[PDB]
Amino acid sequence: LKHFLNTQDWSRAELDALLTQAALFKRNKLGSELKGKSIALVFFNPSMRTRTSFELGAFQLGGHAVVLQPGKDAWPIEFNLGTVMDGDTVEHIAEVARVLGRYVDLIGVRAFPKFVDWSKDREDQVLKSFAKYSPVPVINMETITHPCQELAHALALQEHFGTPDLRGKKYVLTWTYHPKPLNTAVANSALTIATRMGMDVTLLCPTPDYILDERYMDWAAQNVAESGGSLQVSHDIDSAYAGADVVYAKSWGALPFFGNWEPEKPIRDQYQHFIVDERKMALTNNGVFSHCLPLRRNVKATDAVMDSPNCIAIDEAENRLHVQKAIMAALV
Amino acid sequence: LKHFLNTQDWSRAELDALLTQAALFKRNKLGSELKGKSIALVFFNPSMRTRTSFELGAFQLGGHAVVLQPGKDAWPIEFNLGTVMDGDTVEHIAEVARVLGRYVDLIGVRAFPKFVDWSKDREDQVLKSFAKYSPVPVINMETITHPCQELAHALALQEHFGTPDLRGKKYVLTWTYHPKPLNTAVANSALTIATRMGMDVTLLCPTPDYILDERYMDWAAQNVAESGGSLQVSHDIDSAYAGADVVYAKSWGALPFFGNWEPEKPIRDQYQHFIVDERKMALTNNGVFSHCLPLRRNVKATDAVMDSPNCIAIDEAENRLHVQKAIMAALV
Amino acid sequence: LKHFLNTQDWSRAELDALLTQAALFKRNKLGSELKGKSIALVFFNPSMRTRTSFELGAFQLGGHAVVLQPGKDAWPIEFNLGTVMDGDTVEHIAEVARVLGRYVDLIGVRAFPKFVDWSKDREDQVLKSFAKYSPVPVINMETITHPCQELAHALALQEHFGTPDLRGKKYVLTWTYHPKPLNTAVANSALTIATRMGMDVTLLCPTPDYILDERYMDWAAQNVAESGGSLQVSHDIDSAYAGADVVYAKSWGALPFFGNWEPEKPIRDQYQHFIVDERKMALTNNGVFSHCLPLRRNVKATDAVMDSPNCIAIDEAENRLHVQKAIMAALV
Ligand SMILES: CCC[C@H](NC(=O)CCC(=O)O)C(=O)O
Ligand SMILES: CCC[C@H](NC(=O)CCC(=O)O)C(=O)O
Ligand SMILES: CCC[C@H](NC(=O)CCC(=O)O)C(=O)O
């Protein structure tokens, strides 16, 4: 059974096919690839773009999306095995998955880490659980990786440079400020897709503490070795931005401090200058700037940068609808 | 780009056309004016009638409604410009609108005032923001005015009197009791539509403190001067109800006391007799009584009055579905 | 006007017809029995299976479901008559029903008891209110009885034994442990359907305190007298499980202790051994085990029992979708 948990699990040929069908669905939004079918969208965290682009994509394809929010409407799920359920968890994913598997044709899930212990959050238990017990294809709507966002990003880029081949482009994935520590998910997915697309990726972040987990720094290496691109870390802003083609901002907490954020507040606070501003965008080769959104203005980026024509975040967001339709149509 | 923020922005010819298409949709509920299209319903406050009649109207027209509740499911939005987003607001309406604008064909928004400072609430910032940044038509689902409800009301009336011409009818818009101060929105919209329809509007309320904002009292004046009707204020019950044709109840807090309700509690509390009862309905020319709902029984109106055959609140509510389908079909 | 509040209100011929159309819809999921129609699903409590199977069933039949959650999205309703609404209730069911009656073709409602006073909860006020004021057919999505679940259960059984006639089968409806006291609804519905299907029902529970309300113990009697089966109470486990064909577990609080659960905690706590385990399932005539779900693993049943092939809870759950489509198609 084929799922869509990470782009990494897919071959370059399949990804390529996915971006093209995306491009296609973008030319003709309506179809019947999902006529009579349906998908259960399970959210354990907030969402606007994801929720909306999926709910519409299913409608635009003849299917129907059923949104579920365990804890709000649906019953809270248990993921640990053999555990004795006498706490707050009402049912077990082993039953929930097999059941959704009787009503729907697809299952999408969204569950940000709990931020208490990275060791435990890096196992991506919810998504893996779903994938294991579900008799139907499972789709990552973001956990510790945001595969869907990756393709939307990749397409917005291929669109911008007028070609599918993005090799040779200097891609700068920059960390950026945020009053509180956020999920690394997108940063990981960015690094993964940027390296996979064969670009000259530069992971810009404040201190070595902010470097992404090894798994992802390693997936990146294999991608370079494959796409003939390159990965590189930089703690110096200007040296990075210097003549870039693409610039993706994303704030996230330092993994080492998981479960111990107190000592990090003072640390991140001294890097607010990482915000993406015109000055930095000036240092680029008329580069394009993007973000997954929701973006906090004048914190992650400046009003100028957002209103700037080089900001393709809106297009990238819209592609989420086309990319996801390609993923669903594929999986069925 | 044409929106539907207020009936006032529309010419009488257009409104007239809207009520007729409403009457039409009421004869044949199913159509394809929205085939393949969709609308994002953004609610910052509770709703039953609005949510339901829109969600169904879109379905009855081949479209699809995507309900969003910033703060519950979707991410909380920021409306102030240049502000530095390091608080509770996660994204800015400038991005949210442009984005929804990539997924949907229409956007509906509902945001009651915050009741802290009328000066700030009277600017209808959320609706105006949406209208400004959205590349697609925006629809007022109620803010400081309830345009949609107006047409539902106007149609229920034209239906009741068997004619579109409601001139000459004595329309009494009466304030009514409620333990807590409520939005003036409906009262404004009532005054606006009643005067616009050319009736003999009488704004009945306890003290001059309860008279509606100037903007609305002025829109009303221009409507009289146009429709050849009349506006009038009354602090005396009986003199008002006296031989009326229409009676619309609605409770709301006194604008002067915005942000300072403590001193108003004792004031409203001494007007509970404003409740709509049989006695008052007796003083009318076999008039018809209505309310936008949700109505608190035996507080705003008496059980008798509601169960009375002259109560057309249920029909008025149902029209909300027909009126709104006319508005959507129009806007696309 | 015909509703679906309880299976009891229906004749055996109608129920029989319902299970067959269910079996049918199970062979061909898509249809147009609900083309253009819609149903308002009102939930005053959490739900996963019910919400999802209804929302999809309506979609699979050309209709549209509109989910409403009074208190979350929709406004909180008042059910008591003549009461003076100056509290938390915003509108009255008399208006809500008549209104939904103008937008939808069907209304489903879910409202678990309040657990404060059984005397008051046994009147099933919400469902009865809905049925009374609604001009359209009302469907019990579970209150003090779970009619829908009954048919899903009955079908999963007829499917398992390869025949519609389940007479002669030893049906053991066993109470089971749960840290907190739960609704008796399902237990009642089980007793009702098991006896109605003409099986040898045995109500297994700890102490006479746990025996279900008289109404249900009496409906059961009349069912036996009709279906030629039998009802029986057992406080001894083994004597019950002993060579059974069907085993339905369900935890619920002792009715006598309604509003006074303190003194029951210590009582239920000494019956955790009621959990359904392999040992007990061994004592059965290769019986089949089921539960309505959501089930708390290693509390109500053991991991073994759930993963056991005799556990038909997943199939029973899936039937909820087929059974409910038969109920809707019928009611319109
Ligand atoms: C697609 C982005 C989802 C998420 N974003 C947040 O939860 C940020 C919340 C905030 O800044 O208030 C994240 O960090 O990955
Ligand atoms: C269509 C009416 C919406 C709203 N009503 C309320 O929020 C009243 C709430 C209450 O009375 O509990 C208002 O005052 O305009
Ligand atoms: C279909 C079952 C619905 C409900 N179940 C619960 O509310 C159990 C909640 C829990 O065990 O946490 C009940 O008891 O009837």
Side-chain angles (χ1 to χ4, degrees), chain A residues 96-152:
Chain A
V96 181
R98 298 194 284 131
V99 165
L100 284 184
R102 296 307 186 70
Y103 302 152
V104 302
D105 301 295
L106 295 174
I107 297 179
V109 58
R110 165 107 140 200
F112 299 170
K114 311 169 180 172
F115 299 89
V116 171
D117 180 26
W118 186 237
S119 170
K120 292 215 179 220
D121 295 324
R122 64 192 308 294
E123 209 58 32
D124 195 37
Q125 170 179 48
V126 173
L127 191 61
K128 286 181 180 199
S129 290
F130 272 99
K132 171 184 180 187
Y133 301 105
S134 169
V136 296
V138 169
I139 305 180
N140 182 351
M141 298 193 303
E142 190 194 3
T143 51
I144 58 187
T145 56
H146 203 336
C148 277
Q149 186 76 58
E150 293 177 33
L151 308 176

Coordinates of all heavy atoms in Angstrom, one line a residue, chain A residues 96-152:
Chain A
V96 N -9.4 3.3 15.4 CA -9.8 4.5 14.7 C -9.4 4.4 13.2 O -10.2 4.7 12.3 CB -9.2 5.8 15.3 CG1 -9.6 7.0 14.5 CG2 -9.6 5.9 16.7
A97 N -8.2 3.9 13.0 CA -7.7 3.7 11.6 C -8.5 2.7 10.8 O -8.9 2.9 9.7 CB -6.2 3.4 11.6
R98 N -8.7 1.5 11.4 CA -9.4 0.5 10.8 C -10.9 0.9 10.5 O -11.5 0.4 9.5 CB -9.4 -0.8 11.6 CG -8.0 -1.3 11.8 CD -7.9 -2.8 12.3 NE -8.2 -2.8 13.8 CZ -9.1 -3.6 14.3 NH1 -9.8 -4.5 13.5 NH2 -9.4 -3.6 15.6
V99 N -11.4 1.7 11.3 CA -12.8 2.2 11.2 C -12.8 3.3 10.1 O -13.7 3.1 9.1 CB -13.3 2.8 12.5 CG1 -14.6 3.6 12.2 CG2 -13.6 1.6 13.4
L100 N -12.0 4.3 10.1 CA -12.0 5.3 9.1 C -11.8 4.6 7.8 O -12.4 5.0 6.8 CB -10.9 6.3 9.3 CG -11.1 7.3 10.4 CD1 -10.0 8.3 10.4 CD2 -12.5 8.1 10.2
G101 N -11.1 3.5 7.9 CA -10.8 2.7 6.7 C -12.0 2.0 6.1 O -12.0 1.5 5.0
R102 N -13.2 2.1 6.9 CA -14.4 1.5 6.4 C -15.3 2.6 5.8 O -16.2 2.3 5.0 CB -15.1 0.7 7.5 CG -14.4 -0.5 8.1 CD -14.0 -1.4 7.0 NE -13.4 -2.7 7.5 CZ -14.1 -3.6 8.2 NH1 -15.4 -3.4 8.3 NH2 -13.5 -4.6 8.7
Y103 N -15.1 3.8 6.2 CA -15.9 4.9 5.7 C -15.2 5.7 4.6 O -15.8 6.0 3.6 CB -16.2 5.9 6.8 CG -16.9 5.3 8.0 CD1 -16.8 5.9 9.3 CD2 -17.8 4.2 7.9 CE1 -17.5 5.5 10.4 CE2 -18.5 3.7 9.1 CZ -18.3 4.4 10.3 OH -18.9 3.9 11.4
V104 N -13.9 6.0 4.7 CA -13.2 6.8 3.7 C -12.3 6.0 2.8 O -12.0 4.9 3.0 CB -12.5 7.9 4.3 CG1 -13.5 8.8 5.1 CG2 -11.4 7.4 5.3
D105 N -11.8 6.7 1.8 CA -10.9 6.2 0.8 C -9.5 6.7 1.0 O -8.6 6.1 0.5 CB -11.3 6.7 -0.6 CG -12.7 6.3 -1.0 OD1 -13.0 5.1 -1.1 OD2 -13.5 7.2 -1.2
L106 N -9.4 7.8 1.8 CA -8.1 8.4 2.1 C -8.2 9.0 3.5 O -9.2 9.3 4.0 CB -7.8 9.5 1.1 CG -7.6 9.0 -0.3 CD1 -7.4 10.2 -1.2 CD2 -6.3 8.2 -0.4
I107 N -7.0 9.1 4.1 CA -6.9 9.7 5.4 C -5.7 10.6 5.5 O -4.6 10.3 5.1 CB -6.7 8.6 6.5 CG1 -8.0 7.7 6.6 CG2 -6.5 9.2 7.9 CD1 -7.9 6.6 7.6
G108 N -6.0 11.8 5.9 CA -5.0 12.8 6.0 C -4.9 13.1 7.5 O -5.8 13.1 8.2
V109 N -3.6 13.3 8.0 CA -3.5 13.6 9.4 C -2.4 14.7 9.6 O -1.5 14.8 8.9 CB -3.0 12.3 10.2 CG1 -1.7 11.7 9.6 CG2 -2.8 12.7 11.7
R110 N -2.7 15.5 10.7 CA -1.9 16.6 11.1 C -1.7 16.6 12.6 O -2.7 16.6 13.4 CB -2.6 17.9 10.7 CG -2.1 19.2 11.4 CD -1.3 20.0 10.4 NE -1.5 21.4 10.6 CZ -1.3 22.3 9.7 NH1 -0.8 21.9 8.5 NH2 -1.5 23.6 9.9
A111 N -0.5 16.5 13.0 CA -0.2 16.4 14.4 C 1.2 17.0 14.7 O 2.2 16.3 14.5 CB -0.3 15.0 14.9
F112 N 1.3 18.2 15.2 CA 2.5 18.8 15.5 C 3.1 18.1 16.7 O 2.4 17.5 17.5 CB 2.4 20.3 15.9 CG 1.8 21.1 14.8 CD1 1.4 22.4 15.0 CD2 1.7 20.6 13.5 CE1 0.9 23.2 14.0 CE2 1.2 21.4 12.4 CZ 0.8 22.7 12.7
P113 N 4.4 18.2 16.9 CA 5.0 17.5 18.0 C 4.5 18.1 19.3 O 3.9 19.2 19.3 CB 6.5 17.7 17.8 CG 6.6 19.0 17.1 CD 5.5 18.8 16.1
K114 N 4.7 17.5 20.5 CA 4.3 18.0 21.7 C 5.3 18.9 22.4 O 5.0 19.5 23.5 CB 4.0 16.8 22.7 CG 3.1 15.7 22.2 CD 3.2 14.6 23.2 CE 2.4 13.4 22.7 NZ 2.7 12.2 23.7
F115 N 6.5 19.0 21.8 CA 7.6 19.9 22.3 C 8.1 19.5 23.7 O 8.9 20.3 24.3 CB 7.2 21.3 22.3 CG 6.8 21.9 21.0 CD1 5.5 21.8 20.5 CD2 7.8 22.5 20.2 CE1 5.2 22.3 19.2 CE2 7.5 22.9 18.9 CZ 6.2 22.9 18.5
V116 N 7.7 18.4 24.2 CA 8.2 18.0 25.6 C 9.5 17.2 25.5 O 10.4 17.4 26.3 CB 7.2 17.2 26.4 CG1 7.8 16.6 27.7 CG2 6.0 18.0 26.7
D117 N 9.6 16.4 24.5 CA 10.8 15.5 24.3 C 11.0 15.2 22.9 O 10.3 14.3 22.3 CB 10.7 14.3 25.2 CG 12.0 13.4 25.1 OD1 13.0 13.9 24.7 OD2 11.8 12.2 25.3
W118 N 12.0 15.8 22.2 CA 12.2 15.6 20.8 C 12.5 14.1 20.5 O 12.0 13.6 19.5 CB 13.5 16.4 20.4 CG 13.7 16.3 18.9 CD1 14.8 15.9 18.3 CD2 12.8 16.6 17.9 NE1 14.7 15.9 16.9 CE2 13.4 16.3 16.6 CE3 11.4 17.1 17.9 CZ2 12.7 16.5 15.4 CZ3 10.8 17.3 16.7 CH2 11.4 17.0 15.4
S119 N 13.2 13.5 21.4 CA 13.5 12.0 21.2 C 12.2 11.3 20.9 O 12.1 10.5 20.0 CB 14.1 11.5 22.5 OG 14.1 10.1 22.4
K120 N 11.1 11.6 21.7 CA 9.9 11.0 21.5 C 9.1 11.6 20.3 O 8.4 10.9 19.5 CB 9.0 11.1 22.7 CG 9.5 10.3 23.9 CD 8.4 9.7 24.7 CE 8.9 8.8 25.9 NZ 8.1 7.6 26.1
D121 N 9.2 12.9 20.0 CA 8.6 13.5 18.9 C 9.2 13.2 17.5 O 8.5 13.3 16.5 CB 8.6 15.1 19.0 CG 7.8 15.6 20.2 OD1 6.7 15.0 20.5 OD2 8.2 16.6 20.7
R122 N 10.4 12.8 17.5 CA 11.1 12.6 16.2 C 10.7 11.2 15.7 O 11.0 10.9 14.5 CB 12.6 12.7 16.4 CG 13.3 11.7 17.3 CD 14.7 12.0 17.6 NE 15.5 12.3 16.4 CZ 15.8 11.3 15.5 NH1 15.4 10.1 15.6 NH2 16.5 11.6 14.4
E123 N 9.9 10.4 16.4 CA 9.5 9.1 16.0 C 8.3 9.2 15.1 O 7.8 8.2 14.5 CB 9.3 8.2 17.1 CG 9.5 6.8 16.7 CD 10.9 6.5 16.2 OE1 11.9 7.2 16.6 OE2 11.1 5.7 15.3
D124 N 7.6 10.4 15.0 CA 6.5 10.6 14.2 C 5.5 9.4 14.4 O 5.0 8.8 13.4 CB 7.0 10.7 12.7 CG 5.9 11.3 11.8 OD1 5.2 12.2 12.2 OD2 5.9 10.8 10.6
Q125 N 5.2 9.2 15.6 CA 4.3 8.1 16.1 C 2.9 8.2 15.5 O 2.3 7.1 15.0 CB 4.2 8.1 17.6 CG 3.1 7.2 18.2 CD 3.1 7.2 19.7 OE1 3.2 8.3 20.3 NE2 3.1 6.0 20.3
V126 N 2.2 9.3 15.5 CA 0.9 9.4 15.0 C 0.8 9.1 13.5 O -0.1 8.2 13.1 CB 0.3 10.9 15.2 CG1 -1.1 11.0 14.5 CG2 0.2 11.2 16.7
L127 N 1.6 9.7 12.7 CA 1.6 9.4 11.3 C 2.0 7.9 11.0 O 1.4 7.3 10.1 CB 2.6 10.3 10.6 CG 2.5 10.3 9.0 CD1 1.2 10.8 8.6 CD2 3.6 11.2 8.5
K128 N 3.0 7.4 11.7 CA 3.4 6.0 11.5 C 2.3 5.1 12.0 O 2.0 4.1 11.3 CB 4.6 5.7 12.3 CG 5.9 6.3 11.7 CD 7.1 5.9 12.6 CE 8.4 6.5 12.2 NZ 9.5 5.7 12.8
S129 N 1.6 5.5 13.1 CA 0.5 4.7 13.6 C -0.6 4.6 12.5 O -1.0 3.5 12.1 CB -0.1 5.2 14.8 OG 0.8 5.1 15.9
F130 N -1.0 5.8 12.0 CA -2.0 5.8 11.0 C -1.6 5.0 9.8 O -2.4 4.1 9.3 CB -2.2 7.3 10.5 CG -3.3 8.0 11.3 CD1 -2.9 8.9 12.3 CD2 -4.6 7.8 11.0 CE1 -3.9 9.5 13.0 CE2 -5.6 8.4 11.8 CZ -5.2 9.3 12.8
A131 N -0.4 5.1 9.3 CA 0.1 4.4 8.2 C 0.0 2.9 8.4 O -0.4 2.1 7.5 CB 1.5 4.8 7.8
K132 N 0.4 2.4 9.6 CA 0.4 1.0 10.0 C -1.0 0.4 10.0 O -1.2 -0.6 9.4 CB 1.0 0.9 11.3 CG 0.9 -0.5 11.9 CD 1.5 -0.5 13.3 CE 1.5 -1.8 14.0 NZ 1.9 -1.7 15.4
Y133 N -1.9 1.0 10.8 CA -3.2 0.4 10.9 C -4.3 0.7 9.9 O -5.3 0.0 9.8 CB -3.8 0.8 12.3 CG -2.9 0.4 13.5 CD1 -2.1 1.2 14.2 CD2 -2.9 -1.0 13.9 CE1 -1.3 0.8 15.2 CE2 -2.1 -1.4 15.0 CZ -1.3 -0.5 15.6 OH -0.5 -0.9 16.7
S134 N -4.1 1.8 9.1 CA -5.0 2.1 8.1 C -5.0 1.2 6.8 O -3.9 1.1 6.2 CB -4.9 3.6 7.6 OG -5.7 3.8 6.5
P135 N -6.1 0.7 6.4 CA -6.2 -0.1 5.2 C -6.2 0.7 4.0 O -6.2 0.2 2.8 CB -7.5 -0.9 5.4 CG -8.3 0.1 6.1 CD -7.4 0.7 7.1
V136 N -6.2 2.0 4.2 CA -6.3 3.0 3.0 C -5.1 3.9 3.1 O -4.5 4.1 4.2 CB -7.5 3.9 3.0 CG1 -8.8 3.0 2.8 CG2 -7.7 4.6 4.3
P137 N -4.7 4.5 2.0 CA -3.5 5.4 1.9 C -3.6 6.6 2.8 O -4.6 7.3 2.9 CB -3.6 5.9 0.4 CG -4.1 4.6 -0.3 CD -5.3 4.3 0.6
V138 N -2.5 6.8 3.6 CA -2.4 7.9 4.5 C -1.5 9.1 4.0 O -0.5 8.9 3.3 CB -1.7 7.4 5.9 CG1 -1.4 8.6 6.7 CG2 -2.7 6.5 6.6
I139 N -2.0 10.3 4.3 CA -1.3 11.5 3.8 C -0.8 12.5 4.9 O -1.7 12.9 5.8 CB -2.2 12.4 2.9 CG1 -2.7 11.5 1.7 CG2 -1.4 13.6 2.4 CD1 -3.6 12.3 0.7
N140 N 0.4 12.8 5.0 CA 1.0 13.7 6.0 C 0.6 15.1 5.7 O 1.0 15.7 4.7 CB 2.5 13.5 5.9 CG 3.2 14.4 6.9 OD1 2.6 15.2 7.6 ND2 4.6 14.2 7.0
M141 N -0.3 15.6 6.6 CA -0.7 17.0 6.5 C 0.2 17.9 7.4 O -0.2 19.1 7.6 CB -2.2 17.2 6.9 CG -3.1 16.4 6.1 SD -4.9 16.9 6.4 CE -5.0 16.6 8.2
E142 N 1.3 17.4 7.8 CA 2.3 18.0 8.6 C 2.4 17.4 10.0 O 1.4 17.4 10.8 CB 2.2 19.5 8.7 CG 3.4 20.1 9.4 CD 3.2 21.5 9.9 OE1 2.1 22.0 9.7 OE2 4.2 22.1 10.4
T143 N 3.6 17.0 10.4 CA 3.9 16.4 11.7 C 5.3 17.0 11.9 O 5.5 18.2 12.3 CB 3.9 14.9 11.7 OG1 4.7 14.4 10.6 CG2 2.5 14.4 11.5
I144 N 6.4 16.2 11.7 CA 7.8 16.6 11.9 C 8.3 17.0 10.5 O 9.5 17.4 10.4 CB 8.6 15.6 12.6 CG1 8.6 14.3 11.9 CG2 8.1 15.3 14.0 CD1 9.3 13.1 12.6
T145 N 7.5 16.7 9.5 CA 7.8 17.0 8.1 C 6.5 17.5 7.5 O 5.4 17.0 7.9 CB 8.4 15.9 7.4 OG1 7.5 14.7 7.4 CG2 9.8 15.5 7.9
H146 N 6.6 18.3 6.5 CA 5.4 18.9 5.8 C 5.6 18.5 4.3 O 5.8 19.4 3.5 CB 5.4 20.4 6.0 CG 4.0 21.0 5.8 ND1 3.0 20.4 5.0 CD2 3.5 22.1 6.3 CE1 2.0 21.1 5.1 NE2 2.2 22.2 5.8
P147 N 5.5 17.3 3.9 CA 5.7 16.9 2.5 C 4.8 17.7 1.5 O 5.3 18.1 0.5 CB 5.4 15.4 2.5 CG 4.4 15.2 3.6 CD 5.0 16.1 4.7
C148 N 3.5 17.8 1.8 CA 2.6 18.6 0.9 C 3.2 19.9 0.6 O 3.2 20.4 -0.6 CB 1.2 18.7 1.5 SG 0.1 17.2 1.2
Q149 N 3.5 20.7 1.6 CA 4.1 22.0 1.4 C 5.3 22.0 0.5 O 5.4 22.9 -0.3 CB 4.5 22.6 2.8 CG 4.9 24.1 2.7 CD 3.7 25.0 2.6 OE1 2.8 25.0 3.4 NE2 3.7 25.8 1.5
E150 N 6.1 21.0 0.6 CA 7.3 20.8 -0.2 C 7.0 21.0 -1.7 O 7.6 21.8 -2.4 CB 8.0 19.5 0.0 CG 8.6 19.3 1.4 CD 9.3 18.0 1.7 OE1 9.8 17.4 0.7 OE2 9.2 17.5 2.8
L151 N 6.1 20.2 -2.2 CA 5.7 20.2 -3.6 C 5.1 21.5 -4.0 O 5.3 21.9 -5.2 CB 4.7 19.0 -3.9 CG 5.3 17.7 -3.4 CD1 4.2 16.6 -3.6 CD2 6.5 17.3 -4.1
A152 N 4.3 22.1 -3.2 CA 3.7 23.4 -3.5 C 4.8 24.4 -3.7 O 4.8 25.2 -4.6 CB 2.8 23.8 -2.3

